[PDB]
Coordinates of C-alpha atoms in Angstrom, one line a residue:
Chain A
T17 CA 0.0 0.0 0.0
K18 CA 3.1 2.0 0.4
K19 CA 4.4 1.2 -3.2
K20 CA 1.0 1.8 -4.5
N21 CA 1.2 5.7 -4.1
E22 CA 4.2 5.7 -6.3
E23 CA 2.7 3.5 -9.2
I24 CA -0.4 5.8 -9.6
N25 CA 1.9 8.9 -9.4
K26 CA 4.0 7.6 -12.3
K27 CA 1.1 6.8 -14.5
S28 CA -0.3 10.3 -14.1
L29 CA 2.9 11.9 -15.3
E30 CA 2.6 9.8 -18.4
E31 CA -1.0 10.6 -18.9
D32 CA -3.2 7.4 -19.1
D33 CA -0.8 4.8 -20.5
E34 CA -0.1 5.4 -24.2
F35 CA 0.3 1.7 -23.9
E36 CA -3.3 1.2 -24.8
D37 CA -3.8 4.5 -26.7
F38 CA -1.8 3.2 -29.7
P39 CA -4.1 0.2 -30.7
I40 CA -7.2 2.1 -30.3
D41 CA -6.0 4.9 -32.7
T42 CA -4.7 2.6 -35.4
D65 CA 18.8 -11.9 -40.2
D66 CA 15.0 -12.5 -40.0
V67 CA 13.9 -10.6 -43.2
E68 CA 16.3 -12.8 -45.4
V69 CA 14.2 -14.6 -48.1
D70 CA 14.9 -18.3 -48.7
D71 CA 18.0 -18.0 -50.7
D72 CA 17.6 -21.5 -52.0
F73 CA 15.3 -20.4 -54.8
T74 CA 17.7 -17.7 -56.0
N75 CA 20.7 -20.1 -55.7
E76 CA 19.0 -22.7 -57.9
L77 CA 18.9 -20.1 -60.8
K78 CA 22.5 -19.0 -60.2
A79 CA 24.0 -22.5 -60.2
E80 CA 22.2 -23.5 -63.5
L81 CA 23.1 -20.4 -65.6
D82 CA 26.9 -20.7 -64.6
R83 CA 26.8 -24.3 -65.2
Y84 CA 25.5 -24.2 -68.8
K85 CA 28.3 -22.0 -70.0
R86 CA 31.1 -23.6 -67.9
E87 CA 30.3 -27.0 -69.2
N88 CA 30.0 -26.1 -73.0
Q89 CA 32.9 -23.8 -72.9
Chain B
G327 CA 40.4 -58.1 -59.2
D328 CA 41.0 -58.3 -55.4
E329 CA 39.1 -56.2 -53.0
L330 CA 41.7 -56.4 -50.3
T331 CA 44.6 -55.5 -52.4
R332 CA 42.8 -52.3 -53.5
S333 CA 41.5 -51.1 -50.2
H334 CA 44.9 -51.5 -48.6
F335 CA 46.8 -49.9 -51.5
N336 CA 44.6 -46.7 -51.3
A337 CA 46.0 -46.7 -47.7
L338 CA 49.6 -47.6 -49.0
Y339 CA 49.3 -44.6 -51.4
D340 CA 48.3 -42.1 -48.7
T341 CA 50.8 -43.2 -46.2
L342 CA 53.6 -43.0 -48.7
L343 CA 52.3 -39.6 -49.8
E344 CA 52.1 -38.2 -46.3
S345 CA 55.5 -39.3 -45.2
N346 CA 57.4 -38.1 -48.3
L347 CA 55.7 -34.8 -48.0
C348 CA 56.6 -34.1 -44.4
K349 CA 60.3 -34.5 -45.2
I350 CA 60.2 -32.1 -48.2
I351 CA 58.6 -29.3 -45.9
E352 CA 60.7 -29.6 -42.7
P353 CA 63.6 -27.4 -43.6
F354 CA 61.6 -24.5 -44.7
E355 CA 58.8 -22.0 -44.0
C356 CA 57.9 -20.4 -47.2
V357 CA 58.5 -23.1 -49.5
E358 CA 57.6 -22.6 -53.2
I359 CA 54.9 -25.3 -54.1
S360 CA 56.6 -25.7 -57.5
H361 CA 59.7 -26.9 -55.8
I362 CA 57.7 -29.6 -54.0
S363 CA 55.9 -30.5 -57.2
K364 CA 58.9 -31.7 -59.1
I365 CA 60.4 -33.9 -56.3
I366 CA 57.0 -35.4 -55.2
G367 CA 55.9 -35.9 -58.8
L368 CA 52.3 -34.7 -58.3
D369 CA 51.4 -31.8 -60.6
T370 CA 51.3 -28.2 -59.4
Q371 CA 47.4 -28.2 -59.3
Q372 CA 47.2 -31.5 -57.6
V373 CA 49.8 -30.6 -54.9
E374 CA 47.7 -27.4 -54.2
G375 CA 44.6 -29.6 -53.8
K376 CA 46.3 -32.2 -51.4
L377 CA 47.8 -29.4 -49.3
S378 CA 44.4 -28.0 -48.5
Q379 CA 43.0 -31.3 -47.2
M380 CA 46.1 -32.1 -45.2
Chain C
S110 CA 24.5 -68.3 -65.6
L111 CA 21.3 -66.7 -63.9
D112 CA 18.5 -68.9 -65.2
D113 CA 19.7 -72.4 -64.5
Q114 CA 21.1 -71.7 -61.0
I115 CA 17.8 -70.0 -59.7
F116 CA 15.3 -72.3 -61.4
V117 CA 17.0 -75.6 -60.5
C118 CA 17.5 -74.5 -56.9
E119 CA 13.7 -73.4 -56.4
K120 CA 12.2 -76.6 -58.0
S121 CA 14.7 -78.8 -55.9
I122 CA 14.0 -77.1 -52.6
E123 CA 10.2 -77.5 -53.1
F124 CA 10.8 -81.3 -53.8
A125 CA 12.5 -81.8 -50.5
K126 CA 10.2 -80.6 -47.8
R127 CA 7.2 -82.2 -49.4
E128 CA 8.5 -85.5 -50.5
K129 CA 11.1 -85.7 -47.8
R130 CA 11.5 -83.8 -44.4
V131 CA 13.9 -81.4 -42.6
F132 CA 17.0 -83.6 -42.8
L133 CA 17.6 -83.1 -46.6
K134 CA 15.7 -79.7 -46.4
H135 CA 18.2 -77.7 -44.3
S136 CA 21.2 -79.1 -46.3
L137 CA 19.6 -77.6 -49.5
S138 CA 19.2 -74.3 -47.7
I139 CA 23.0 -73.9 -47.2
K140 CA 23.5 -74.4 -50.9
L141 CA 20.9 -71.8 -51.9
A142 CA 22.4 -69.5 -49.3
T143 CA 25.7 -69.7 -51.1
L144 CA 24.0 -69.2 -54.5
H145 CA 22.2 -66.2 -53.2
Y146 CA 25.5 -64.7 -52.2
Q147 CA 27.2 -65.4 -55.5
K148 CA 24.4 -63.4 -57.0
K149 CA 25.3 -60.5 -54.8
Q150 CA 21.9 -60.5 -53.3
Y151 CA 22.8 -60.0 -49.7
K152 CA 19.4 -59.5 -47.9
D153 CA 18.0 -62.5 -49.6
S154 CA 20.9 -64.5 -48.2
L155 CA 20.6 -63.0 -44.8
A156 CA 17.0 -64.3 -44.4
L157 CA 17.8 -68.0 -45.2
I158 CA 20.6 -68.0 -42.7
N159 CA 18.6 -66.5 -40.0
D160 CA 15.8 -69.1 -40.1
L161 CA 18.0 -72.2 -39.4
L162 CA 20.1 -71.5 -36.9
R163 CA 18.8 -70.6 -33.4
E164 CA 16.0 -73.2 -33.7
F165 CA 18.6 -75.7 -34.6
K166 CA 20.8 -74.4 -31.8
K167 CA 19.6 -77.4 -29.9
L168 CA 20.5 -79.6 -32.9
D169 CA 24.0 -78.0 -32.7
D170 CA 26.7 -80.7 -32.9
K171 CA 27.0 -80.9 -36.7
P172 CA 29.9 -79.6 -38.8
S173 CA 27.3 -78.4 -41.2
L174 CA 26.0 -75.7 -38.9
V175 CA 29.5 -74.2 -38.4
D176 CA 29.4 -73.6 -42.2
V177 CA 26.4 -71.4 -41.7
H178 CA 28.4 -69.0 -39.6
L179 CA 31.1 -68.9 -42.3
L180 CA 28.6 -67.8 -45.1
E181 CA 27.1 -65.2 -42.6
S182 CA 30.5 -63.5 -42.2
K183 CA 30.8 -63.0 -45.9
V184 CA 27.3 -61.4 -45.9
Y185 CA 27.9 -58.7 -43.2
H186 CA 31.1 -57.9 -44.8
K187 CA 29.2 -56.9 -48.0
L188 CA 26.6 -54.9 -45.9
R189 CA 29.8 -53.1 -45.2
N190 CA 29.8 -53.2 -41.5
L191 CA 32.2 -54.5 -39.1
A192 CA 29.9 -54.5 -35.9
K193 CA 28.5 -57.7 -37.3
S194 CA 31.4 -59.1 -39.3
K195 CA 33.0 -59.3 -35.9
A196 CA 29.9 -60.9 -34.4
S197 CA 29.7 -63.5 -37.0
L198 CA 33.4 -64.1 -37.0
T199 CA 33.2 -64.6 -33.3
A200 CA 30.3 -66.9 -33.8
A201 CA 32.1 -69.1 -36.3
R202 CA 35.1 -69.2 -34.0
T203 CA 32.9 -70.4 -31.1
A204 CA 31.3 -73.2 -33.1
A205 CA 34.6 -74.1 -34.7
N206 CA 36.2 -75.0 -31.5
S207 CA 34.9 -78.5 -32.4
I208 CA 37.7 -80.2 -34.3
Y209 CA 35.4 -82.3 -36.5
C210 CA 35.5 -79.7 -39.3
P211 CA 37.6 -80.7 -42.5
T212 CA 40.8 -78.9 -43.3
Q213 CA 38.9 -77.0 -46.0
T214 CA 36.5 -75.2 -43.7
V215 CA 39.3 -74.3 -41.2
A216 CA 41.2 -72.7 -44.2
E217 CA 38.1 -70.5 -44.9
Chain D
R20 CA -0.3 -48.5 -31.8
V21 CA 0.9 -47.7 -35.4
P22 CA -2.2 -45.7 -36.6
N23 CA -1.6 -43.3 -33.7
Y24 CA 1.4 -41.6 -35.3
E25 CA 1.0 -42.7 -38.9
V26 CA -2.2 -40.8 -39.6
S27 CA -0.7 -37.5 -38.7
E28 CA 2.7 -38.0 -40.5
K29 CA 1.1 -39.0 -43.8
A30 CA -1.6 -36.3 -43.7
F31 CA 1.0 -33.5 -43.5
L32 CA 2.2 -34.1 -47.0
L33 CA -1.1 -33.6 -48.5
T34 CA -1.6 -30.4 -46.7
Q35 CA 1.4 -28.8 -48.1
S36 CA 0.9 -26.9 -51.4
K37 CA 4.7 -26.3 -51.1
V38 CA 5.1 -29.6 -52.9
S39 CA 4.4 -30.1 -56.4
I40 CA 0.6 -30.2 -57.2
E41 CA 1.2 -33.6 -58.8
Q42 CA 2.9 -35.0 -55.6
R43 CA 0.2 -33.3 -53.5
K44 CA -2.6 -35.3 -55.2
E45 CA -0.8 -38.7 -54.9
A46 CA -0.7 -38.2 -51.1
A47 CA -4.3 -37.7 -51.1
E48 CA -5.1 -41.4 -51.8
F49 CA -3.3 -42.7 -48.8
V50 CA -4.6 -40.1 -46.5
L51 CA -8.2 -40.6 -47.6
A52 CA -8.3 -44.3 -46.9
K53 CA -7.2 -43.8 -43.3
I54 CA -9.7 -41.0 -42.7
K55 CA -12.6 -43.4 -43.3
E56 CA -11.2 -46.6 -41.7
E57 CA -10.0 -45.0 -38.5
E58 CA -13.0 -42.7 -38.4
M59 CA -11.1 -39.5 -37.8
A60 CA -14.3 -37.5 -38.1
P61 CA -14.2 -34.6 -35.6
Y62 CA -10.6 -33.8 -36.5
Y63 CA -11.2 -34.3 -40.2
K64 CA -13.6 -31.4 -40.2
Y65 CA -10.7 -29.2 -39.1
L66 CA -8.5 -30.6 -41.6
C67 CA -10.7 -30.1 -44.6
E68 CA -10.5 -26.4 -44.0
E69 CA -6.7 -26.2 -44.2
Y70 CA -5.6 -27.2 -47.7
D95 CA -20.3 -38.4 -47.7
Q96 CA -22.2 -38.2 -44.4
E97 CA -21.4 -41.9 -44.1
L98 CA -18.0 -41.5 -42.4
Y99 CA -19.6 -39.4 -39.7
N100 CA -23.0 -41.8 -39.7
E101 CA -20.4 -44.6 -39.2
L102 CA -18.7 -42.4 -36.4
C103 CA -22.2 -42.0 -34.8
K104 CA -22.8 -45.8 -35.1
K105 CA -19.3 -47.0 -34.2
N106 CA -19.3 -44.5 -31.3
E107 CA -22.7 -45.5 -30.0
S108 CA -21.9 -49.3 -30.5
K109 CA -18.5 -49.2 -28.9
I110 CA -19.9 -46.7 -26.1
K111 CA -22.8 -49.0 -25.5
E112 CA -20.8 -52.2 -25.3
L113 CA -18.1 -50.8 -23.0
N114 CA -20.6 -48.6 -20.9
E115 CA -22.6 -51.3 -19.3
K116 CA -19.4 -53.5 -19.2
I117 CA -17.8 -50.8 -17.0
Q118 CA -21.2 -50.4 -15.1
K119 CA -21.0 -54.2 -14.5
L120 CA -17.3 -53.9 -13.5
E121 CA -18.3 -51.5 -10.7
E122 CA -20.8 -53.9 -9.3
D123 CA -18.0 -56.4 -9.5
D124 CA -14.6 -56.4 -7.9
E125 CA -10.9 -55.2 -8.6
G126 CA -10.7 -51.4 -9.1
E127 CA -6.9 -51.1 -9.1
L128 CA -6.0 -53.1 -12.1
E129 CA -8.9 -54.2 -14.2
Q130 CA -11.1 -51.0 -14.1
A131 CA -7.8 -49.0 -14.8
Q132 CA -7.1 -51.3 -17.8
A133 CA -10.7 -50.5 -19.2
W134 CA -10.3 -46.8 -18.6
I135 CA -7.0 -47.0 -20.7
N136 CA -9.2 -48.5 -23.5
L137 CA -11.7 -45.6 -23.4
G138 CA -8.8 -43.3 -24.0
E139 CA -7.6 -45.6 -26.8
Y140 CA -10.8 -44.8 -28.7
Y141 CA -10.6 -41.2 -27.9
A142 CA -7.1 -41.0 -29.3
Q143 CA -8.4 -42.8 -32.5
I144 CA -10.9 -39.8 -33.2
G145 CA -8.5 -37.0 -32.6
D146 CA -10.0 -35.4 -29.5
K147 CA -7.0 -34.9 -27.2
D148 CA -9.4 -33.7 -24.4
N149 CA -11.4 -36.9 -24.0
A150 CA -8.4 -39.3 -23.9
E151 CA -6.7 -37.2 -21.2
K152 CA -9.7 -37.6 -18.8
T153 CA -9.9 -41.4 -18.8
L154 CA -6.1 -42.0 -18.9
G155 CA -5.6 -39.8 -15.8
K156 CA -7.9 -42.1 -13.9
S157 CA -5.6 -44.9 -14.3
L158 CA -2.7 -43.0 -12.7
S159 CA -4.9 -42.0 -9.7
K160 CA -5.4 -45.6 -8.8
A161 CA -2.5 -47.3 -7.3
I162 CA -0.6 -49.1 -10.0
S163 CA 2.8 -50.8 -10.9
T164 CA 5.7 -48.4 -11.5
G165 CA 6.3 -49.9 -14.9
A166 CA 2.6 -49.3 -15.6
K167 CA 2.8 -45.7 -14.5
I168 CA 5.5 -44.6 -16.9
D169 CA 3.6 -46.3 -19.8
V170 CA 0.4 -44.3 -19.2
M171 CA 2.2 -40.9 -19.1
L172 CA 4.0 -41.6 -22.4
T173 CA 0.7 -42.1 -24.2
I174 CA -0.8 -38.8 -22.9
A175 CA 2.2 -36.9 -24.3
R176 CA 2.0 -38.7 -27.7
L177 CA -1.4 -37.1 -28.2
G178 CA 0.3 -33.8 -28.5
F179 CA 2.4 -34.9 -31.4
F180 CA -0.7 -35.7 -33.3
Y181 CA -1.5 -31.9 -33.6
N182 CA 2.1 -30.9 -33.1
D183 CA 1.9 -28.5 -30.2
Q184 CA 5.0 -27.6 -28.4
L185 CA 3.5 -26.2 -25.1
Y186 CA 1.5 -29.4 -24.3
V187 CA 4.3 -31.8 -25.0
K188 CA 6.8 -29.9 -23.0
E189 CA 5.0 -30.1 -19.6
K190 CA 3.9 -33.8 -19.9
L191 CA 7.4 -35.2 -20.6
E192 CA 8.7 -33.5 -17.3
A193 CA 6.6 -35.9 -15.1
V194 CA 7.8 -39.0 -17.0
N195 CA 11.3 -38.4 -15.5
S196 CA 10.0 -38.7 -12.0
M197 CA 8.8 -42.2 -12.6
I198 CA 11.6 -43.1 -15.2
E199 CA 14.3 -44.4 -12.7
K200 CA 11.8 -45.8 -10.3
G201 CA 10.7 -48.2 -12.9
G202 CA 14.3 -48.2 -14.1
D203 CA 13.4 -49.9 -17.4
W204 CA 15.7 -49.3 -20.4
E205 CA 12.7 -50.3 -22.6
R206 CA 10.7 -47.2 -22.0
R207 CA 13.6 -44.9 -21.5
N208 CA 14.3 -45.5 -25.3
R209 CA 10.8 -44.3 -25.9
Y210 CA 11.4 -41.3 -23.7
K211 CA 14.6 -40.3 -25.4
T212 CA 13.0 -40.1 -28.8
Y213 CA 9.8 -38.3 -27.7
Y214 CA 11.9 -35.5 -26.3
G215 CA 13.9 -35.7 -29.6
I216 CA 10.6 -34.8 -31.7
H217 CA 9.8 -32.0 -29.3
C218 CA 13.3 -30.5 -30.0
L219 CA 13.3 -31.2 -33.7
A220 CA 10.0 -29.5 -34.0
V221 CA 11.5 -26.3 -32.8
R222 CA 14.5 -24.5 -34.2
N223 CA 17.1 -25.7 -31.7
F224 CA 19.1 -28.7 -33.2
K225 CA 21.8 -29.0 -30.5
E226 CA 19.6 -31.1 -28.2
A227 CA 18.1 -33.2 -30.9
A228 CA 21.3 -34.5 -32.3
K229 CA 22.4 -35.8 -29.0
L230 CA 19.2 -38.0 -28.4
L231 CA 18.5 -38.9 -32.1
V232 CA 22.0 -40.4 -32.8
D233 CA 21.6 -42.4 -29.7
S234 CA 18.2 -43.8 -31.2
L235 CA 20.3 -45.4 -33.9
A236 CA 21.7 -47.7 -31.3
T237 CA 18.1 -48.4 -30.0
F238 CA 14.9 -47.6 -31.6
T239 CA 11.3 -48.8 -30.7
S240 CA 8.6 -48.0 -33.3
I241 CA 5.9 -48.1 -30.8
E242 CA 3.8 -44.8 -31.2
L243 CA 6.9 -43.4 -32.9
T244 CA 7.8 -42.5 -36.6
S245 CA 9.6 -45.4 -38.3
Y246 CA 13.3 -46.1 -38.0
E247 CA 13.9 -45.0 -41.6
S248 CA 12.7 -41.5 -40.8
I249 CA 15.0 -41.5 -37.7
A250 CA 18.0 -42.4 -40.0
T251 CA 17.4 -39.4 -42.3
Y252 CA 16.7 -36.9 -39.4
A253 CA 19.7 -38.1 -37.4
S254 CA 21.9 -37.3 -40.4
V255 CA 20.5 -33.7 -40.9
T256 CA 21.0 -32.8 -37.3
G257 CA 24.3 -34.5 -37.3
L258 CA 25.8 -32.0 -39.8
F259 CA 24.6 -28.9 -38.1
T260 CA 26.0 -30.0 -34.6
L261 CA 29.2 -31.8 -34.3
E262 CA 32.7 -30.4 -35.2
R263 CA 35.0 -32.2 -37.9
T264 CA 36.3 -35.6 -36.6
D265 CA 33.6 -36.4 -34.1
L266 CA 30.6 -35.3 -36.2
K267 CA 32.1 -37.2 -39.3
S268 CA 32.5 -40.4 -37.3
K269 CA 29.0 -40.1 -35.8
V270 CA 27.3 -39.5 -39.2
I271 CA 29.5 -41.9 -41.2
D272 CA 31.5 -44.6 -39.3
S273 CA 28.0 -45.4 -37.8
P274 CA 27.5 -49.2 -38.9
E275 CA 23.8 -48.8 -39.0
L276 CA 23.6 -46.2 -41.8
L277 CA 25.8 -48.2 -44.0
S278 CA 23.8 -51.4 -43.5
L279 CA 20.6 -49.6 -44.4
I280 CA 22.0 -48.4 -47.8
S281 CA 20.0 -45.9 -49.7
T282 CA 16.6 -47.4 -49.9
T283 CA 14.6 -44.2 -50.3
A284 CA 15.5 -41.1 -52.2
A285 CA 15.5 -38.7 -49.2
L286 CA 18.0 -40.6 -47.0
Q287 CA 20.2 -40.7 -50.3
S288 CA 20.4 -37.0 -50.7
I289 CA 21.3 -36.1 -47.2
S290 CA 24.1 -38.8 -47.1
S291 CA 25.4 -37.5 -50.5
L292 CA 25.7 -34.1 -48.8
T293 CA 27.5 -35.6 -45.8
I294 CA 30.0 -37.3 -48.2
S295 CA 30.8 -34.1 -50.1
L296 CA 31.3 -31.8 -47.0
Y297 CA 33.6 -34.3 -45.5
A298 CA 35.5 -35.2 -48.7
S299 CA 36.0 -31.4 -49.4
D300 CA 34.5 -32.1 -53.0
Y301 CA 33.1 -28.6 -53.4
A302 CA 32.0 -29.1 -57.1
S303 CA 29.3 -31.4 -56.0
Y304 CA 28.5 -29.7 -52.8
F305 CA 26.1 -27.2 -54.4
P306 CA 24.0 -29.8 -56.4
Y307 CA 23.7 -31.9 -53.3
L308 CA 22.7 -28.8 -51.3
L309 CA 19.7 -28.1 -53.7
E310 CA 18.5 -31.8 -53.6
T311 CA 18.4 -32.0 -49.8
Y312 CA 16.2 -28.9 -49.8
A313 CA 13.6 -30.3 -52.1
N314 CA 13.5 -33.9 -50.7
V315 CA 14.5 -33.8 -47.1
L316 CA 13.7 -30.5 -45.7
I317 CA 10.1 -30.0 -47.0
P318 CA 8.7 -33.7 -46.6
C319 CA 9.7 -33.2 -43.0
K320 CA 6.9 -31.6 -40.9
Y321 CA 9.6 -30.6 -38.4
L322 CA 12.1 -28.9 -40.7
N323 CA 9.4 -27.3 -42.8
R324 CA 9.5 -24.2 -40.5
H325 CA 13.2 -24.3 -40.3
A326 CA 14.0 -24.9 -44.0
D327 CA 15.1 -21.3 -44.3
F328 CA 17.7 -21.1 -41.6
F329 CA 19.0 -24.6 -42.3
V330 CA 20.0 -24.4 -46.0
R331 CA 21.5 -20.9 -45.7
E332 CA 23.4 -22.0 -42.5
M333 CA 25.1 -24.8 -44.7
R334 CA 26.4 -22.4 -47.3
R335 CA 28.1 -20.5 -44.4
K336 CA 29.7 -23.6 -42.8
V337 CA 31.1 -24.9 -46.0
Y338 CA 32.6 -21.6 -47.1
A339 CA 34.2 -21.1 -43.7
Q340 CA 35.8 -24.5 -44.0
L341 CA 37.5 -23.8 -47.4
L342 CA 38.8 -20.5 -46.2
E343 CA 40.2 -21.9 -42.9
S344 CA 42.9 -23.8 -44.8
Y345 CA 43.8 -20.9 -47.0
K346 CA 45.7 -17.6 -46.3
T347 CA 44.4 -16.2 -49.5
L348 CA 42.4 -17.6 -52.4
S349 CA 41.3 -16.0 -55.7
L350 CA 37.5 -15.1 -56.4
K351 CA 38.0 -16.8 -59.8
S352 CA 39.3 -19.9 -58.1
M353 CA 36.7 -20.0 -55.4
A354 CA 33.9 -19.4 -57.8
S355 CA 34.9 -22.1 -60.1
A356 CA 35.1 -24.8 -57.5
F357 CA 31.6 -24.3 -56.3
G358 CA 30.0 -24.0 -59.8
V359 CA 28.6 -20.5 -59.5
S360 CA 29.5 -17.5 -61.5
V361 CA 32.1 -15.1 -60.2
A362 CA 29.4 -12.4 -59.6
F363 CA 27.1 -14.8 -57.8
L364 CA 29.7 -15.8 -55.3
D365 CA 30.4 -12.2 -54.4
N366 CA 26.8 -11.3 -53.7
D367 CA 26.3 -14.4 -51.5
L368 CA 29.6 -13.8 -49.7
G369 CA 28.4 -10.2 -48.8
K370 CA 25.6 -11.7 -46.7
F371 CA 27.8 -13.9 -44.7
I372 CA 30.6 -11.4 -43.8
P373 CA 29.0 -8.9 -41.3
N374 CA 27.1 -11.6 -39.5
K375 CA 30.5 -13.1 -39.1
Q376 CA 31.4 -16.8 -39.3
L377 CA 33.7 -16.6 -42.4
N378 CA 36.0 -14.2 -40.8
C379 CA 37.0 -12.7 -44.2
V380 CA 37.1 -9.8 -46.6
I381 CA 37.4 -9.4 -50.3
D382 CA 40.0 -7.0 -51.7
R383 CA 37.7 -6.5 -54.8
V384 CA 39.8 -4.5 -57.2
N385 CA 42.6 -7.2 -57.0
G386 CA 40.1 -10.0 -56.9
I387 CA 41.9 -11.7 -54.0
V388 CA 40.0 -12.9 -50.9
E389 CA 41.9 -12.3 -47.6
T390 CA 41.1 -14.0 -44.3
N391 CA 41.7 -12.0 -41.2
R392 CA 43.9 -13.9 -38.8
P393 CA 43.5 -12.8 -35.2
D394 CA 43.5 -16.4 -34.0
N395 CA 45.9 -16.2 -31.2
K396 CA 46.5 -14.5 -27.8
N397 CA 44.6 -11.5 -29.2
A398 CA 41.6 -13.8 -29.9
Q399 CA 41.6 -15.1 -26.4
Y400 CA 41.9 -11.7 -25.0
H401 CA 38.9 -10.3 -26.9
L402 CA 36.6 -13.2 -25.9
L403 CA 37.6 -13.1 -22.3
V404 CA 36.8 -9.4 -21.7
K405 CA 33.3 -9.8 -23.2
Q406 CA 32.5 -12.7 -20.9
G407 CA 33.9 -10.5 -18.0
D408 CA 31.5 -7.8 -19.2
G409 CA 28.6 -10.1 -18.9
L410 CA 29.4 -10.9 -15.2
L411 CA 29.9 -7.2 -14.4
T412 CA 26.4 -6.1 -15.4
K413 CA 24.7 -8.9 -13.4
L414 CA 26.6 -7.9 -10.3
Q415 CA 25.4 -4.3 -10.5
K416 CA 21.7 -5.2 -11.0
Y417 CA 21.7 -7.5 -7.9
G418 CA 23.9 -5.1 -5.9
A419 CA 21.5 -2.2 -6.4
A420 CA 18.5 -4.3 -5.4
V421 CA 19.8 -5.5 -2.0
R422 CA 21.2 -2.1 -1.2
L423 CA 17.8 -0.6 -1.0
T424 CA 17.0 -2.8 2.0

């Protein structure tokens, strides 16, 4: 009950909680590189071999 | 024609190859690979390839 | 060649567990086992071997059953594993402590 | 026992539209037979969404028949004697039907009852395995995780090696299923020594999976031996196409034959990674991760290489190599640069006392922060 005064005082300095204001108002990207690699391997190969 | 002969001669090849090699490279540090290539009798490309594995 | 060896063997083996009993029967199964190996069919040969032996482990006293272990060792060698070429080599040695075996089999 | 795992493993393939449309429709035959036979009807309704009333009429019938039989049997069992052993055995059997139809909920009730009642230690462990197996059918990580903890309490009391094999492999599937491979490799290589198929995906699958994990985890010698000098994998040959591809990969990595490495990499993607339910999600990280390991390996043995040399060995164009290298370098496993204008590839060499220095401070830094956080806390009291 002691800590409680402080928790309410902080919230008020924020105003509400923004936390809930936002939803009301509104190499992890790396593509599988296997598909691109397949194309690469094959074009190089064709030329290499028949060179 | 013999399974044994062949298995154990791949082994004979490698041991012979390894031992001869060690002796060629003991005196120096910054040995030309070309120098090695004549003595050992494995071509310049084939020497590069073995060295990498070893 | 191919034809003769497999056809003669099949017809014979059938004749021999229907006209006669187990005695001739299991003798012809070693011979087929061998022919299955020469044919480089190694699973097929595994299966024949496996049927005899533990059931006839109470009929163990015969030279002929020592031979079975010999053929087996050749088979696991061709499955290309040495866990079992050892096991089967150990098993031939165990049954070939009996001295009744001819010179030829001991050489093998 | 077998239908319990097989239904789900087979159905997966059909689901995927990743696979060729042609492959997708062949899977359909197998899956379809087992829907009707095993009466998978509640769950089937779910599964039709994701890609004859008789099945279901059959369900109602079967259900009612089976129910009605066992009902009054169990009502008769109550009037009658032994509640420890014989009623517990029947209660297992209600759960067996529930597990047939794909309701996880209804199996879990009945099978709990068995545990409650005082039973053999051997018997206890058994029952808990089955409950956890029901999680695999859907493939939920959260449910599986919690059930397998309990199993370890009873595992040494029973002290059977029979069911500890089953335990090792169950925890294996839970790990495979998630991204982490470190743990899986350790249990799944061991299952090579001893496998039990009971409510567990066949040994042939385990051979293939053990090999994938193998590569990712162990370093040179050790890993090589574990995924090659294994007698079991040699005896089993290449009996299916998928186990072939992965083994081919293993050969080429080890043998440092880098021409055939790249063809082999592409095959494993199509035929190993995607059939697999487990590594479907992890296809992306896995295949990429292999290109990095292999490249590192070539570079380790070389002070310097040429771009033209390196390129040729793999079977990609010179341009392609450069692009794909520029992904690996800031992430840092290759430990390398490319002096582009000259076309040489240099490999930074701080492997020494300098290396050991750098690592050691960072580890020190990590201990320093924790001390502060804890210090400050106590200090307020």
